[PDB]
Amino acid sequence: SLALSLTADQMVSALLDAEPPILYSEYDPTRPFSEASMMGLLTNLADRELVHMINWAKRVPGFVDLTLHDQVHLLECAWLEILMIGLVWRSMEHPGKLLFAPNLLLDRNQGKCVEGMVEIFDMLLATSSRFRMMNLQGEEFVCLKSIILLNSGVYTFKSLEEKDHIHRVLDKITDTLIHLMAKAGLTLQQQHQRLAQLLLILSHIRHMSNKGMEHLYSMKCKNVVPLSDLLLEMLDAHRLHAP
């Protein structure tokens, strides 16, 4: 029940405390790039991030109220969206670059090291620039990331009771976003406009995840480098439905 009794500020403090750490890549600037090496770095990084993401999700208010089966489903649905929003967030203050890790800062030209990747990189850079122009706050970011986790798979799941609870927690997160904006002195018209602007960005993050996933579960991208069992299973949750 915890999620529904939290005040706005308590939701924010809970979400901030639950934030995963920023991991390092194995990037060696003395080992020039290559489709293989870039893929290796990104997969190795994502793989380690997934473990922290799983433990983060457990701390998102309302998430542990769900059945294990439903938790699995939400994470399978949202994992790449969640990695991506994290990436665009830490990349904000690096115009023209994606900060994959503190020791891995890439621009679009290096996105060309893997066929089909530059298009996605450009989308990620645009999203990061959008967050930068809006001066996205850390408190807002953690709300948005939790919304992705709860929302992305909610329509692809007694069983109805689980959806309803999810909806109530999502409403509380909306309340929380608005509370943060009001606290920041925004007028009511400004609050609604900003709330909408942020939520529309989620549609773009969905788009990016779907386009990326489509490349990632292609036989070509899966045989560039040996993939970990956990990533293979996360990817397969999506490949299962592909043509």
């Binding site: 799983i54 457990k58 699995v72 994470l75 299973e233 996360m234």
Partner: peptide, 9 residues
């Protein structure tokens, strides 16, 4: 599933 396992922990 590994995800299932890690969540259950």
């Amino acid at each position: 599933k590994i995800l299932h396992r890690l969540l259950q922990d």
